[PDB]
Amino acid sequence: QNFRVYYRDSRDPVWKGPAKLLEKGEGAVVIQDNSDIKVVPRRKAKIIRDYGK
Amino acid sequence: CSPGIWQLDCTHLEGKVILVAVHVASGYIEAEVIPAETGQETAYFLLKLAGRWPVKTVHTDNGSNFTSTTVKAACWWAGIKQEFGGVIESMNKELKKIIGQVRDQAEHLKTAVQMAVFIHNKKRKGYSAGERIVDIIATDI
Amino acid sequence: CSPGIWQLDCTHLEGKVILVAVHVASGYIEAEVIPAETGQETAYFLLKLAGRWPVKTVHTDNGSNFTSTTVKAACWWAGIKQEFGGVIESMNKELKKIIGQVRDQAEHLKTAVQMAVFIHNKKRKGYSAGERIVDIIATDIQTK
Amino acid sequence: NFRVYYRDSRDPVWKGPAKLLEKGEGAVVIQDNSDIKVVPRRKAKIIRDYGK
Ligand SMILES: Cc1ccc(C2CC2)c(-c2ccc3c(c2C)CCCO3)c1[C@H](OC(C)(C)C)C(=O)O
Ligand SMILES: Cc1ccc(C2CC2)c(-c2ccc3c(c2C)CCCO3)c1[C@H](OC(C)(C)C)C(=O)O
Ligand SMILES: [Cl-]
Ligand SMILES: [Mg+2]
Ligand SMILES: [Mg+2]
C-alpha cells in the first residue's frame, strides 16, 4: 500500500528519510524529502512499504 | 492501558549496554546486551520484538539511537507508532537489583541479565508478568 | 500437542548459523543468527526463550551444541526437559523460502531473518501462528 | 541448595553436576560420583536451585 524511501546522499553515510516516492526507474528513484526533489541511484535507496500495517 | 504499548530504554552495567523493552500493561520485560548503543542495534531489536508480540506503539526518550533513521524504517515496516518523551525506569532499577542478586552465578553479564529477566517474568505477585502479557493479548484477539 | 513443547535446530545461509525454535502446537517461531554453532550460544538462546514463554520440553537432534554441558545447565536451571530424536525441518525450509523472497530488501542476512520470522508469525491461515501461541498458552493459564 | 559444574584435568569441557559441600573464597569442595574434589573458584560454576 504505502511506501517511504530512505537514502544516502553526498558521501554522508547517515541514512536520510522518510522521503516521498515520486517515481521508480531502473537505475534511479525520484524522491521528495521535505521541500527538495532528489534523484537517487537505486543502490543508495531503500523503498520500504508499511508491511505490518 | 492498551495491550499494544511498549516502553524501551537503555541501561548500563560493567561498561556494557542493556536494551530493555517493557510491555506496560503487564510489566513483562525482554532485554538484550547490545555491542553499541546505536540506531542499527535498536532497529534490529525492534524487528525481533515486533515478530513475537503485537507491537503497536513504542514509547522512548529522545536518545539518539531511538530517533535514528534505521529505527524509523523498522517501525514503518513493522507498523509501529513511535512516541517520544516512568515504568521502564522503575523496571531498569528492578532489573539491575535482580542482576546484582544473581551476578556471581555466571561469568558473563548477559547471562545474569537473562536469568534476571526470567526471574522477573516468572514471579507471581496472583499472576506473573509473563502470564499477564499472554492473558492480556489473548483476550484482545 | 502440549503447550510446553518446542523444537530447536540450526540451519545455514551465507555461511551464517541460524538457530530456530518452533512452538510445535502453534507453528510460531523465533530465530537468531548466532556467531558459532556452539553449546554456549545455544544455551544463551535457550535462556532468552525460556524467560518469554513456558518452555517445558525441548526436542532436538543430537548435534553437539544441543548435547553440550552448557545447554544441560541452562535446561536444568530453567526447568526444561530435553528430548533427542519433522516440524522444525519443514520450518527451516519455509523460513529459507521467505528469506529468499525478501533478501534483497536488506543489507544483512540477520535483518532478512527477522523480517521472515515476522512474516511467518503474522500470516493468517483464521489465526496466525503468533495469535495461536498466545491463545494456546493463555487457555492453559486461564483454566488452571 | 546449589549445583556445581567444574573443570579440572586440563579439559575445557564442563563436568558435573556435582554436589556442593563447601564454597571457599578460593576453592570449592564438591563430590562427584563418589570422589571428593577441591576445585578453584574460577573453575567452578555454582548455580542456586531455580527453575523447577
Ligand atoms: C544496515 C541497514 C541500514 C539502513 C536501513 C534503513 C534504511 C534506513 C536498514 C533497515 C532497517 C530496518 C528495516 C529494514 C532495513 C533495510 C528493512 C525493513 C525492516 O526494517 C538496515 C538493516 O540493518 C539493520 C541492522 C536492521 C539496521 C539492513 O540489514 O539493511
Ligand atoms: C560461560 C559459561 C560456562 C559454563 C556454563 C555452565 C556450567 C556449564 C555457563 C552457564 C550455562 C547456563 C546457565 C548458567 C551458566 C553459568 C547459569 C544459570 C543459567 O543457565 C556459562 C554461562 O555463559 C553462557 C553464555 C550462558 C553459556 C556464564 O555466563 O557463566
Ligand atoms: Cl532510471
Ligand atoms: Mg534513556
Ligand atoms: Mg540439526
Side-chain angles (χ1 to χ4, degrees), chain B residues 34-77:
Chain B
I34 55 177
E37 189 165 350
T38 63
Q40 299 204 2
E41 295 286 337
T42 304
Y44 185 65
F45 181 99
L46 274 168
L47 292 175
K48 295 189 295 177
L49 180 75
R52 321 185 168 106
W53 304 107
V55 179
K56 302 294 213 287
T57 305
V58 162
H59 200 102
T60 67
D61 59 33
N62 283 88
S64 62
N65 56 306
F66 291 126
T67 64
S68 65
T69 308
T70 48
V71 165
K72 294 189 198 322
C75 290
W76 174 253
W77 184 82

Side-chain angles (χ1 to χ4, degrees), chain C residues 38-40 42-43 63-73 82:
Chain C
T38 58
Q40 70 160 42
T42 301
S64 72
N65 60 307
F66 291 123
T67 65
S68 54
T69 308
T70 46
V71 166
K72 287 186 202 170
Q82 289 190 268

Side-chain angles (χ1 to χ4, degrees), chain B residues 16-19 31-36 41 109-111 113-114, chain C residues 44:
Chain B
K16 294 184 181 279
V17 177
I18 306 160
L19 178 52
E32 294 273 358
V33 175
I34 55 177
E41 295 286 337
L109 173 65
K110 62 187 196 188
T111 303
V113 172
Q114 299 307 341
Chain C
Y44 185 66

